RNA sequence: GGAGAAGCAAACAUUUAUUGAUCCCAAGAUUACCGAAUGGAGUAAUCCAGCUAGCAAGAUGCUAGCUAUCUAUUAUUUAAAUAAUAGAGGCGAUACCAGGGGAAGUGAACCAUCUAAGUACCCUGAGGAAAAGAAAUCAAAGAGAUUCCCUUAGUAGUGGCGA
RNA sequence: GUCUGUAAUAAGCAAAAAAGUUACAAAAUAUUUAUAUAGAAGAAUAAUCUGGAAAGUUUAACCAAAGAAGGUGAUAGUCCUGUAAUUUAAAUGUAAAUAUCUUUUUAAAAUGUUCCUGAGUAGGACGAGGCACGAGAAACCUUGUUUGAAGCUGGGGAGACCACUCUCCAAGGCUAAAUACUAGAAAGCUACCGAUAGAGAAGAGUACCGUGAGGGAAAGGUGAAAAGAACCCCGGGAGGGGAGUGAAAUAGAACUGAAACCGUAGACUUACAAGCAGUCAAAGCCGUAAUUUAUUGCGGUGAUGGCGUGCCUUUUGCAUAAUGAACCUGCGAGUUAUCAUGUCUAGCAAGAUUAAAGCAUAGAAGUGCUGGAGUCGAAGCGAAAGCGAGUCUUAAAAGGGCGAUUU
RNA sequence: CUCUAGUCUGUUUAAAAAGGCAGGGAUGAGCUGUGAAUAGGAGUGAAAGGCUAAACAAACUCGGAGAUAGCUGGUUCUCCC
RNA sequence: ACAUUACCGAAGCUUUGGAUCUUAACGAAAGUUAAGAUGGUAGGGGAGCGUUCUGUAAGCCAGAGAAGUUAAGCUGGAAAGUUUGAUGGAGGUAUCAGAAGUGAGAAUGCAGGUAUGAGUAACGAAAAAAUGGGUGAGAUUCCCAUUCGCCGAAAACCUAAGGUUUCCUGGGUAAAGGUCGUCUUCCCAGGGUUAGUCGGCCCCUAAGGCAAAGCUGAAAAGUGUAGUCGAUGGGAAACGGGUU
RNA sequence: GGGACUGACACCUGCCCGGUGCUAGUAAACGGCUAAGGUAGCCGGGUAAGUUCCGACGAAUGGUGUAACGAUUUGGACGCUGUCUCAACGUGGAGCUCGGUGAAAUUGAAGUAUCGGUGAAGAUGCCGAUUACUUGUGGUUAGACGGAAAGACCCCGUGAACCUUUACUAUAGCUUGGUAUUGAGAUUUGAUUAA
RNA sequence: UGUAAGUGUAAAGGCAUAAGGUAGCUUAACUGUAAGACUGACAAGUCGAACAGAUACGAAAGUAGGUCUUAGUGAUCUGGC
């Protein structure tokens, strides 16, 4: 019904010697419509908050189980906002040549906009975590501010 | 999300054509005729695999019966004496014996006639 | 909410559900000519009954919410 | 904005551009004829004029500027008649809104009630939103204009109590 | 305040408040690094190896508010254009704010008598429509044909109607925002498409068909660069063969170039035979590997023997002379959105769960909170009132119906 | 110059209704050029259920519309119970 | 026909090798044994292969040769899977998990290419061609010449209705002309239509159309007077000859 | 002027008002012939041999005759003929061969023989038996239940469309009454209410 | 002779203790109900001891919830009393 064209029967029902047909844009015909094709749809849904919380606890435990890949660094800040300094800090810590996720205890805009450009880096605040990033992160670097805020964030 | 890549049908057809190499006429190249002839051929292959046993046993029996035509022992009686004297040799073995080494088979027959 | 399944009103007005599955209903033949019908027949027709277990699945389809 | 440019692609030989081009943007000028087309008429892109100005204007010459109609407001005895300004004509959105007209294919395994459905479509109006909008209201709760959502809820009722 | 002169009040003038988004109307500038419509700046690579070509291999850096996306001879953060964060406004357009300007009040708290407070209107009769509500007990509103009121000591409404009571005050006219819509403009995104796809259209409603209304196709790709094959030979040319360009000319108007179809060459078999063309056995010939070498295998052909009624769909039943296909290659059908119910998985638990929507950060159509209005369980029975582990049928637990105390 | 009884060719024809032979009308209810009027549940019809752009027991185009079908056809990879 | 001893004869039975499932036993379990049980449409349940995209993946594998057909060989119980070559010259992709435009042999299916009939029917009217010469690479089909034949109230000439360069000169033969072609209404370039007396325009009206006003209708309009348009009609003017 | 009916002309055109139309009547109305029972009229010859032909239902949806007329139907006679016994020859366009150009429908394929049988019940594909060197061309269609047209006939589908009716249900139009448009007079026909 | 007669009404199965016939009394031709079943897709249909109230008949025990049994019938919706 949405392909351009007329809805006239291309030829008579009987007597022509051809296969019966109703409209030119028949899904069978070339250039016609498409039967049972894709239509716009809402893929989003919201999980129960308890399940989401339990998943967060589980992934954090799974990451912290390993001593080397999970590390904690004393609070700092990049007051200059440059990228050299942050990159130096990562390349001092991280070892597994891959995704690195930094956890923060606040919204330190300087660090965030200093790290927005590193190669394989993801900066996350404590209250805005993402399970995919945590789960696939091969190096996980947290501040002790982030540790404390996570403690009262998820103890409740 | 269109999922079209047609590297499948050519694969099926290539395997079929590979197995249908020596067939007559258009049955060796066309997809439809090759598939029809191959599928009936495989069923024939199964049936015939079971039939080959019957065919070969029939051949062995006929060969034994031919090798005994000389003497006066009809091979029903030969099988008779064979079992009765407790010689558990095989139809294939006897058939091959009558060709490779006729005198051993003849001695077996002399021994059966008892 | 675009497509909530509609109940079958003519069935709602005649069927009722018990707590664990059975369906309650009012018996027929006590609506009309009644002089000829025997008294014990009428007394049994007055009291309500339960349907056979063979209709319960279809009825549960007819009354999607009740 | 700065070194090329002569459209959308180069070719062939001609110029321009550092005297700031080409190009982009803003504004202005020019802006044939048809077309709501409106001086009349007409087979749309074209014949026929009325009046005024200039072409030696002139014997069916050319150019420029006016004369269409409706409604509101008055210059008058707003009807008649001209005059004066003001607002409209048509197109665009194979979208939205308001008003008017309003089916049929179907379902009810028929059909005539009903359903589909104020649906499609037609017509009249404007807007950027429209319509509606500040209670002689909701409604038995104490609220307080209109409209749009989540719930109430497939509930209350209605229906050849059939769908 | 009919005129003059007094107690006694109006018409103007000090003093203030608003106003082109309704609320009076018509503007005009300055002014706002506000915005729309042209722009500017803009970071950080050398060597080596393969190769025609490096951006790639490898060894070491540097930048990053810029590792968004393209082009660059093979795969670029640092080659070019752009990108982050900033930022060009003479002129034009759109916005507020400030005065100017315009307009208004140049007064209010205060008791009872009279005036008005919206008229063919409210309502009723008949015929219709809209309200979820089809005349049904059918309110109420609009409304065609008729009839027809009260004047706050009032009237309308409270789903027939009556009484009381509680609310409201019509028959005058405006009103932004939240809301619908995107033909399009700019900036972006995609578990969206990659030439039978995607808009019909990568070239367009064109070619073509019909008197007209109208209907409506098919056709993308050389090479990194034309650097388009100088010249020579055959030929009228076309075209091909050489010589050159190029990494390649079975890259020469075209990339990768299959199947259907048409061929050439070599090997084997076939002209005494009745083969759904196949399978099971099998001599000879040819190719090939082993075993000292002509007998066993991998192979291709195959005389001869045995068995065997193509396939699909439809029927009690088909090789059927029932149906369908020229072949080949592409395209071509149980999906999505919600509700009911069952099961599985995950989580909580006599509780479980938020919807709309808001805030914060980000620009990253997220996901972390806020938000409990509502729904499903926790008590059912009875038409209902109502009663409750009991309830209804009944004077009766007197017997049963539906429950439960064992969720 | 206008019409088509009878017969034949043709009938995957030259022609989606002709041609080869013939016949009727041929000063009149005549033929014909050039304009105009009558449009779909309507028109027109010296009247056969004819015609109305080669198809008319209700024209054509677009839209409703992907109308409804108890009817027919089709429905694609594998294995195990 | 009646007796004696047999044999052949099925995917049955028995035996050998291997696999799955149910039950039972053993074993910590994995599994190892015993028993039996597995024809199968409709239809029910369960277990997998393969395709595309997404996260894993700023990962890994590629110009020292990706993807794709393509020859041969090999593995898996089936869907199938991956090694060596030729061709190809630029992107694919492990594991895990998710999502479908997720798998074609047919619907008198759609689209495209190519067989078949078949080098067969036709090559379009029973008006008829023949010779010589010229042009040209090439002539039964072009041009020229001489004969013959056909139409001749035409198959001739001059103007409409229509077509719109098809007209003339020169050059050329991809296609197209039912064959061939030096030729064409084919293609390319250039050239070509001169009006006071012709036909229109114009001044008039037939049928007809529009139509202020008036009248009638939900709208849109329908009727219709005064007027204005509407030729195949009626109205000023020319004939002969020559030239490209 | 409109509609219906009949159909030059000639002789005739009768009976019936129950039913149905029209305004008790009307039939040159629909129709019939108990309402009324239909009035007039409508073997022989031909051939040796003749199911043909010629001569001995129904009255204005007309009956019975009729000169002339007719690309109308049927019978007979004369003349004429290849229509026939009976075919042969000749002419012209195709067909045949070669050269150039070059289709169509159909098409699961095919190293597709026949007879007697069996079988979704008419066999190219099965059984038995028989026949047959391989491959073309020119002829003819017996078969391949040939090709072409989802059989037009039959039947089915709670199919579709059209038409008819004293089928059902609405309605244009027509018609009647009341009311608004719509006033004033005169008079007695009454009803009702009391006096 | 021993049910072939007769059992409102068709036929069958039954009826001597008669369910046949006669006579007296009488209205159980009841209300609320019901353990447990047959027949059955469902909806329906049929038998039913026994309990409470009110009786009828009989001295009482008991019987009586129509007709010897097996056909004499019609859902739902709507409307009336």
Curated annotation (Swiss-Prot), chain A:
One of its GO terms (biological process) is translation. Signal peptide: none annotated. One of its GO terms (molecular function) is rRNA binding. Residues 6-19 have a biased composition (Basic residues). One of its GO terms (cellular component) is ribonucleoprotein complex. Residues 1-19 are annotated as: Disordered. Keywords: Ribonucleoprotein, Ribosomal protein, RNA-binding, rRNA-binding. It comes from the Bacteria. The keyword Transmembrane helix does not apply. Transmembrane segments: none annotated. One of the primary rRNA binding proteins, this protein initially binds near the 5'-end of the 23S rRNA. It is important during the early stages of 50S assembly. It makes multiple contacts with different domains of the 23S rRNA in the assembled 50S subunit and ribosome. Forms part of the polypeptide exit tunnel. Part of the 50S ribosomal subunit. Belongs to the universal ribosomal protein uL4 family. This is Large ribosomal subunit protein uL4. It comes from Borreliella burgdorferi (strain ATCC 35210 / DSM 4680 / CIP 102532 / B31) (Borrelia burgdorferi). The chain holds residues 54 to 209 of 209 of the full protein.
UniProtKB/Swiss-Prot annotation, chain B:
Keywords: Ribonucleoprotein, Ribosomal protein, RNA-binding, rRNA-binding. The keyword RNA-binding applies. The keyword Calcium does not apply. It comes from the Bacteria. CDD domains: Ribosomal_L20 (cd07026). InterPro entries: Ribosomal_bL20, RIBOSOMAL_L20_CS, Ribosomal_protein_bL20_C. GO terms for molecular function: rRNA binding; structural constituent of ribosome. One of its GO terms (cellular component) is ribosome. Coiled coil: none annotated. One of its GO terms (biological process) is ribosomal large subunit assembly. PANTHER family: 39S RIBOSOMAL PROTEIN L20 (PTHR10986). Binds directly to 23S ribosomal RNA and is necessary for the in vitro assembly process of the 50S ribosomal subunit. It is not involved in the protein synthesizing functions of that subunit. Belongs to the bacterial ribosomal protein bL20 family. This is Large ribosomal subunit protein bL20. It comes from Borreliella burgdorferi (strain ATCC 35210 / DSM 4680 / CIP 102532 / B31) (Borrelia burgdorferi). The lineage of its organism: Bacteria, Pseudomonadati, Spirochaetota, Spirochaetia, Spirochaetales.
Swiss-Prot record, chain C:
The keyword Membrane does not apply. It holds the Pfam family Ribosomal_L35p. Transmembrane segments: none annotated. InterPro entries: Ribosomal_bL35, Ribosomal_bL35-like, Ribosomal_bL35_CS, Ribosomal_bL35_sf. One of its GO terms (biological process) is translation. SUPFAM superfamilies: L35p-like. It comes from the Bacteria. The keyword Ribosomal protein applies. Keywords: Ribonucleoprotein, Ribosomal protein. GO terms for cellular component: cytosolic large ribosomal subunit. One of its GO terms (molecular function) is structural constituent of ribosome. HAMAP family: Ribosomal_bL35 (MF_00514). NCBIfam families: rpmI_bact. Belongs to the bacterial ribosomal protein bL35 family. This is Large ribosomal subunit protein bL35.
């Amino acid at each position: 019904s949405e392909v351009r064209g007329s809805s006239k029967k291309p030829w008579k029902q009987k007597g022509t010697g051809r296969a019966r047909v109703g409209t030119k844009r028949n899904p069978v015909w070339i250039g016609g419509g498409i039967a049972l094709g894709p239509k716009p749809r809402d893929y989003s849904y919201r999980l129960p908050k308890k399940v989401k919380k339990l998943a967060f606890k589980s992934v954090l435990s799974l990451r912290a189980a390993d001593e080397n890949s999970f590390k904690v660094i004393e609070n700092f800040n990049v007051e200059s906002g440059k990228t050299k300094d942050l990159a130096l800090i990562i390349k001092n810590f991280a070892s597994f040549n891959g995704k690195v996720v930094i956890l923060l205890g606040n919204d330190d805009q300087m660090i965030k906009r200093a790290g927005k450009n590193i190669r394989d880096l993801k900066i996350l605040s404590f209250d805005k975590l993402r399970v995919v990033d945590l789960f696939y992160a091969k190096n996980l670097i947290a501040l002790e501010s982030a540790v404390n805020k996570l403690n009262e964030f998820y103890i409740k | 999300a269109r999922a079209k890549n047609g590297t499948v049908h050519v694969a099926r057809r290539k395997r079929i054509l590979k197995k249908t190499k020596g067939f007559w006429g258009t049955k060796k190249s066309n997809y439809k005729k090759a598939k029809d002839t191959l599928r009936k051929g495989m069923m024939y292959a199964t049936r015939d695999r079971k039939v080959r046993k019957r065919d070969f046993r029939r051949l062995w029996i006929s060969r034994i019966s031919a090798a005994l035509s000389d003497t006066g022992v009809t091979y029903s009686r030969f099988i008779e004496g064979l079992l009765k004297s407790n010689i558990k040799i095989n139809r294939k073995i006897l058939s091959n014996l009558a060709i490779e080494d006729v005198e051993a088979f003849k001695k077996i027959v002399l021994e059966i006639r008892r | 909410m675009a497509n909530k399944m509609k109940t079958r009103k003519s069935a709602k007005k005649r069927y009722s559900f018990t707590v664990n599955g059975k369906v309650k209903y009012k018996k027929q033949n006590l609506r009309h000519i009644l002089t000829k019908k025997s008294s014990k027949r009428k007394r049994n027709l007055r009291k309500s009954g339960n349907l056979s277990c063979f209709e319960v699945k279809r009825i549960k389809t007819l009354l999607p919410y009740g």
